[PDB]
Amino acid sequence: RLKKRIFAAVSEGCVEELVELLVELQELCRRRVPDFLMHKLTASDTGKTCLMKALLNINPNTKEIVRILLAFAEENDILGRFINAEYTEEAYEGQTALNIAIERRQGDIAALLIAAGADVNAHAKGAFFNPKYQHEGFYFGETPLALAACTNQPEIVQLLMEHEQTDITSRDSRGNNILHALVTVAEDFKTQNDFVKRMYDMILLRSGNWELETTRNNDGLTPLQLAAKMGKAEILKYILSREIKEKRLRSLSRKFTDWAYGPVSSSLYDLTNVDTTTDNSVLEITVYNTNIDNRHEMLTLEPLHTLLHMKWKKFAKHMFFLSFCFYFFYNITLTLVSYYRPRGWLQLLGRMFVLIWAMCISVKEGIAIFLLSDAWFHFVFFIQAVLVILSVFLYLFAYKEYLACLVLAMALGWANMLYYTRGFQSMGMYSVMIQKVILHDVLKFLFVYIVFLLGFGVALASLIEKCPKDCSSYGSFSDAVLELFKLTIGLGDLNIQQNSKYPILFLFLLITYVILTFVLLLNMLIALMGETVENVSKESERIWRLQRARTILEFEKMLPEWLRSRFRMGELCKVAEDDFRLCLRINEVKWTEWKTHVSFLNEDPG
Amino acid sequence: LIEKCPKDCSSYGSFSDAVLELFKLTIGLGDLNIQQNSKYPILFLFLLITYVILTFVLLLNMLIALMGETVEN
Amino acid sequence: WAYGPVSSSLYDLTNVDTTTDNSVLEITVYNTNIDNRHEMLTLEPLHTLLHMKWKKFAKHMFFLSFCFYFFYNITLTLVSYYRPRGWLQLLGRMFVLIWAMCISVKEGIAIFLLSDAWFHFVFFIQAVLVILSVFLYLFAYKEYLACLVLAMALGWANMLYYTRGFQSMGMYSVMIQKVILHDVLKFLFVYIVFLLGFGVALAS
Amino acid sequence: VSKESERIWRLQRARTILEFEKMLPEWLRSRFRMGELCKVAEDDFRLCLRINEVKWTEWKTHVSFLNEDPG
Numbered sequence: 001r002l003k004k005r006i007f008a009a010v011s012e013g014c015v016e017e018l019v020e021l022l023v024e025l026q027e028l029c030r031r032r033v034p035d036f037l038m039h040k041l042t043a044s045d046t047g048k049t050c051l052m053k054a055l056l057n058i059n060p061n062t063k064e065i066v067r068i069l070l071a072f073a074e075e076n077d078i079l080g081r082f083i084n085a086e087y088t089e090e091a092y093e094g095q096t097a098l099n100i101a102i103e104r105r106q107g108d109i110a111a112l113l114i115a116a117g118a119d120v121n122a123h124a125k126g127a128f129f130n131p132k133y134q135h136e137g138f139y140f141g142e143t144p145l146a147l148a149a150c151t152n153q154p155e156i157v158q159l160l161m162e163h164e165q166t167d168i169t170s171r172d173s174r175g176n177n178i179l180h181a182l183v184t185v186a187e188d189f190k191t192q193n194d195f196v197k198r199m200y201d202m203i204l205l206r207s208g209n210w211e212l213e214t215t216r217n218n219d220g221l222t223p224l225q226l227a228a229k230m231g232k233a234e235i236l237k238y239i240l241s242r243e244i245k246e247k248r249l250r251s252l253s254r255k256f257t258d259w260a261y262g263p264v265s266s267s268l269y270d271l272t273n274v275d276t277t278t279d280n281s282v283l284e285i286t287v288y289n290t291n292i293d294n295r296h297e298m299l300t301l302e303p304l305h306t307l308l309h310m311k312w313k314k315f316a317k318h319m320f321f322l323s324f325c326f327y328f329f330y331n332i333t334l335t336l337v338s339y340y341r342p343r344g345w346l347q348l349l350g351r352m353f354v355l356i357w358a359m360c361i362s363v364k365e366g367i368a369i370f371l372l373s374d375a376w377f378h379f380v381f382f383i384q385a386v387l388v389i390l391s392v393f394l395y396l397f398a399y400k401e402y403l404a405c406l407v408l409a410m411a412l413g414w415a416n417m418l419y420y421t422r423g424f425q426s427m428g429m430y431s432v433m434i435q436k437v438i439l440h441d442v443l444k445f446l447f448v449y450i451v452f453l454l455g456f457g458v459a460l461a462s463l464i465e466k467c468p469k470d471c472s473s474y475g476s477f478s479d480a481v482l483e484l485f486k487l488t489i490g491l492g493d494l495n496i497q498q499n500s501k502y503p504i505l506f507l508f509l510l511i512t513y514v515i516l517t518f519v520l521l522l523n524m525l526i527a528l529m530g531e532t533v534e535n536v537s538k539e540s541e542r543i544w545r546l547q548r549a550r551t552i553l554e555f556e557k558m559l560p561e562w563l564r565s566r567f568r569m570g571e572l573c574k575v576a577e578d579d580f581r582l583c584l585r586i587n588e589v590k591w592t593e594w595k596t597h598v599s600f601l602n603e604d605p606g
Numbered sequence: 607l608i609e610k611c612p613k614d615c616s617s618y619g620s621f622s623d624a625v626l627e628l629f630k631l632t633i634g635l636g637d638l639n640i641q642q643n644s645k646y647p648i649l650f651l652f653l654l655i656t657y658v659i660l661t662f663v664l665l666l667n668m669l670i671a672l673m674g675e676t677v678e679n
Numbered sequence: 680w681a682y683g684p685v686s687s688s689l690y691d692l693t694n695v696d697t698t699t700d701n702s703v704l705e706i707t708v709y710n711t712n713i714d715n716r717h718e719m720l721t722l723e724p725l726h727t728l729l730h731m732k733w734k735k736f737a738k739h740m741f742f743l744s745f746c747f748y749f750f751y752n753i754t755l756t757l758v759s760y761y762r763p764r765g766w767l768q769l770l771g772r773m774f775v776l777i778w779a780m781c782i783s784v785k786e787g788i789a790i791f792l793l794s795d796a797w798f799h800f801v802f803f804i805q806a807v808l809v810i811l812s813v814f815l816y817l818f819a820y821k822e823y824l825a826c827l828v829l830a831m832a833l834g835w836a837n838m839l840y841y842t843r844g845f846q847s848m849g850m851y852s853v854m855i856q857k858v859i860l861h862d863v864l865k866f867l868f869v870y871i872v873f874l875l876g877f878g879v880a881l882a883s
Numbered sequence: 884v885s886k887e888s889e890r891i892w893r894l895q896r897a898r899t900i901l902e903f904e905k906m907l908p909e910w911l912r913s914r915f916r917m918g919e920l921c922k923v924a925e926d927d928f929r930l931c932l933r934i935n936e937v938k939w940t941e942w943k944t945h946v947s948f949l950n951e952d953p954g
């Protein structure tokens with residue numbers, strides 16, 4: 001039991017003399033060699049060495065325990081397999097002692113380890129360290145450097161990165177390198193105090209080149225595209241607007257001031273993986289990707305806001321107005337064909353226009369539907385166009401029901417103009433408010449009102465006798481239901497001689513319906529709408545801006561290659577010794593932060 | 607949706623009277639007959655109920671809520 | 680086992696988990712002489728106990744209870760509507776009778792052992808109206824229809840109880856209840872004073 | 884009431900949960916019985932209820948644990 005005695009005296013550490021006696025025992029025994037010396041100091045189940053066991057359980061004397069441990073392992077010249085050992089369990093695989101010393105924040109022990117040959121490129125290629133479900137697993141990046149950086153140990157990060165054998169460019173099993181990992185664990189300032197932006201800057205500058213920021217994980221995302229997918233708007237704003245004054249590190253920036261004078265400064269933001277000219281850009285991801293709902297803040301970041309405004313004012317404003325004009329005349333032709341139906345040259349042109357515009361919307365929103373609240377509008381545009389072409393089909397046959405589909409298509413098209421309200425900010429914010437009210441208030445009201453209307457309609461229809469003579473408005477369930485609805489909208493009259501056999505119960509139930517709807521439900525709808533309207537007013541400009549951004553990017557994808565290349569925001573800019581990357585000037589004015597400007601590329605401010 | 611009757615048997619006959627009938631509904635004024643000489647009376651009733659929801663339930667109460675926001679600012 | 684950000688605690692559950700007489704969970708959920716039950720429910724051992732109970736059996740017992748009350752109410756509704764002015768029919772009619780007796784004894788026991796119990800009262804009154812209606816119908820009493828329509832009406836009202844299964848609908852219901860108490864009843868009193876005084880004033 | 888409705892609903896649903904649990908028969912109550920017994924001290928072995936959690940601001944070397952290997 002010498003193995004278990006050493007294990008207990010090392011994980012407990014009551015004294016160094018206990019472990020010294022046990023180690024003298026093991027040395028005087030095993031020589032009677034390295035392999036089974038280890039087997040007499042190992043955990044043959046998981047592979048956990050007594051160095052691992054000591055590090056797992058740090059006591060006030062651990063830096064001496066582990067020191068005697070490795071000095072023994074070096075006196076027997078087994079140090080290599082000793083301090084570089086790894087777990088064999090399927091859930092902690094590849095975990096060495098250094099992952100332990102770093103997770104435990106034991107900077108001194110980790111320094112002693114890697115000073116004595118601790119393999120630092122060791123990957124925590126394990127189901128705990130590479131989690132699938134939260135709270136069983138901690139995703140940090142599967143390396144000692146990614147652990148030291150994600151657990152906010154800048155001293156251990158500096159100590160690891162200064163090591164000649166740490167491999168900062170190494171990627172984990174998920175494809176991530178240290179910078180993807182930092183982006184994933186980046187939470188917020190609310191829950192993390194924003195140390196990850198600092199570790200990101202430190203690691204990127206301490207490896208001064210683009211190798212880290214350019215690598216894509218197994219999802220095909222760089223740290224920047226990942227910071228956009230996951231809605232990390234702080235690390236994204238940090239990367240997007242990264243300006244390094246260092247002359248030896250001026251090629252690792254994304255935005256470089258080129259002519260600032262006083263209050264006015266003209267910047268030159270880098271637009272490489274940001275401007276919709278690549279596969280999944282930061283702008284495209286920031287506008288589209290809907291698995292976050294954190295697209296809120298990411299859209300006003302300095303290059304993206306100006307890219308969207310350049311796209312709008314270059315082509316998308318006009319494509320949107322042209323799209324609106326086409327939908328408007330399509331709807332007017334549907335309206336006039338419905339109205340002037342039978343109970344030419346410019347006529348037939350309009351009729352085939354609705355047919356072909358219906359087929360175009362059909363194929364477009366059908367393609368866009370199979371490639372899938374934001375797409376309510378794909379559904380209704382598709383359903384409207386389908387109703388139009390179905391109406392045309394039933395009309396070129398001898399089917400009279402073409403008018404049902406045609407009037408429904410006309411109705412739904414006029415509803416679909418709520419889409420085009422997103423061209424203006426006033427009307428667009430009004431529409432996101434209408435939509436929020438319909439979802440949060442009106443549908444809840446309609447459900448409750450229909451359970452009232454239907455229950456009271458059957459109650460009041462049940463109370464009514466059979467007259468031999470139409471002497472009751474509440475005779476059937478439907479007729480009753482009909483004028484409970486009429487009562488709600490205050491339309492007819494109210495006769496309370498309804499041929500009931502229990503007229504006081506009939507009147508009690510009618511008064512109860514009136515209270516429940518008129519007094520309670522409708523006024524409570526007003527109160528709840530007032531609560532919705534006040535909450536949605538604080539986010540409606542954000543939601544409208546996101547809607548218009550999605551529309552801008554939809555229109556940009558419609559353009560043909562020559563037109564997309566013709567528009568192409570951002571002018572190429574001499575930015576470093578030889579970088580010459582597409583950039584996007586954004587002049588700005590600041591009055592509080594006074595300083596002598598040394599960073600520029602044109603010392604003369606245009 | 608309304609057919610041609612041979613007799614005044616529909617309030618929604620022309621666009622104007624239909625427009626007048628809808629306006630009366632919003633202000634709560636006339637009666638509501640739903641036998642309007644439509645050929646698709648369930649679609650007529652669906653569209654009438656939809657108008658009532660959109661105006662009575664949504665637009666007028668949302669006007670109250672928006673006025674409440676204006677008045678406070 | 681805490682590692683980095685993730686730490687796994689092991690809360691003790693000895694006098695906390697409804698397996699003893701008056702547990703901390705039972706007292707925290709029930710005891711109504713404080714109205715300070717606000718904050719206590721979210722405490723860590725307790726909050727996870729209620730969610731484990733919900734997702735282990737109570738979600739399903741609640742949906743099953745709702746389904747039984749719903750078909751009980753639908754049978755009351757259809758028996759009211761299709762009253763006279765079978766095999767699957769008589770099954771439904773005796774179903775309302777026995778479900779009414781079960782609710783009767785349950786909410787009567789729960790009433791004698793006593794705003795939170797509005798619902799005991801209305802569930803009991805509804806079930807009593809149903810069994811009274813059945814009694815008046817197996818006799819030759821025509822007033823069974825008054826009790827039956829009132830029972831149907833009150834049962835559809837009692838579904839506001841089952842709205843507490845979802846958070847959206849459940850919060851909407853506590854809001855409806857608060858509005859009815861704080862606003863609608865005050866309105867109804869004042870409106871009746873005005874309606875009755877002006878009615879006598881105008882009739883005069 | 885919007886500021887307290889989630890609290891009130893949660894209390895209502897808790898009362899319903901505890902009402903249903905009292906309806907169950909003894910074998911079903913014992914069958915459900917949240918919380919797994921846990922070696923917790925030298926000899927305590929009290930029923931316990933694991934609740935994993937994540938914290939990013941309070942950094943410290945962890946000395947309190949009973950399984951030094953995090954599952």
Ligand SMILES: COc1ncnc(OC)c1C(=O)Nc1nc(C(F)(F)F)c(-c2ccnc(C(C)(C)C#N)c2)s1
Pocket residue numbers: 451452453454455456457459512515516829830831832833834835836837838839859
């Ligand atoms: C969700 O509600 C429903 N859903 C579908 N159908 C329904 O009825 C067909 C119902 C329903 O509420 N029925 C009712 N029964 C009764 C009872 F008289 F029996 F008490 C009701 C009543 C009685 C006395 N004062 C009220 C007020 C309005 C003051 C309150 N609060 C209501 S209301």
Ligand SMILES: COc1ncnc(OC)c1C(=O)Nc1nc(C(F)(F)F)c(-c2ccnc(C(C)(C)C#N)c2)s1
Pocket residue numbers: 872873874875876877878880
């Ligand atoms: C609790 O109130 C009641 N409850 C039961 N029955 C009632 O009356 C039958 C009443 C009641 O209000 N009676 C009233 N009498 C008079 C008076 F004209 F004689 F002065 C009233 C009056 C007079 C002048 N201007 C107002 C307005 C509306 C402008 C105001 N403010 C109200 S009001």
